[PDB]
């Protein structure tokens with residue numbers, strides 16, 4: 001079994017928790033409910049453990065959680081496609097990942113969540129342009145319908161494998 | 167906004 005330490009980041013309310021809980025517990029939280037989650041899965045023939053750290057902008061101090069962050073192997077950079085501010089804020093998160101990891105080359109996937117919503121304000125081309133500037137994949141997801149959810153996390157696993165031997 | 171430190175993703179408001 002190969003373990004992948006994945007960290008989900010992004011601005012308030014973009015669906016970080018909803019994506020993680022959909023992936024791991026197969027449940028969509030329509031409540032706004034402001035942890036760590038694990039699931040064993042087979043990815044490209046490899047028995048894999050997805051070890052997900054679900055972050056937030058308001059959390060109680062925890063030295064161990066800071067240790068979890070620094071050892072994260074790949075990051076999902078989440079914005080919501082109906083939240084232009086969350087898209088604008090991606091650049092802050094990308095820079096902060098590099099600080100937390102003390103590294104210029106960290107596996108990352110850009111995720112545009114809430115793709116089920118018709119009130120879109122971030123065009124796919126905008127998000128593609130941003131991802132291209134960063135040299136990372138862009139994937140649209142809906143934690144609600146599950147569209148793209150496995151693809152986003154499995155793409156991050158594949159980005160980690162491109163970066164380092166697992 | 168920004169981040170309060172360089173260890174995690176806790177934010178601060180610039181407003």
Ligand SMILES: Nc1nc2c(ncn2[C@@H]2O[C@H](COP(=O)(O)OP(=O)(O)NP(=O)(O)O)[C@@H](O)[C@H]2O)c(=O)[nH]1
Nearest residue numbers: 012013014015016017018029030056114142143144
């Ligand atoms: N329609 C729709 N709503 C979603 C989706 N993902 C999350 N939501 C909704 O958006 C709200 C915030 O979701 P949540 O997972 O708590 O986001 P978060 O990024 O973890 N918030 P926080 O930064 O406070 O931890 C909730 O009402 C949730 O149901 C999605 O794909 N589609």
Ligand SMILES: [Mg+2]
Nearest residue numbers: 016017034056
């Ligand atoms: Mg959350």
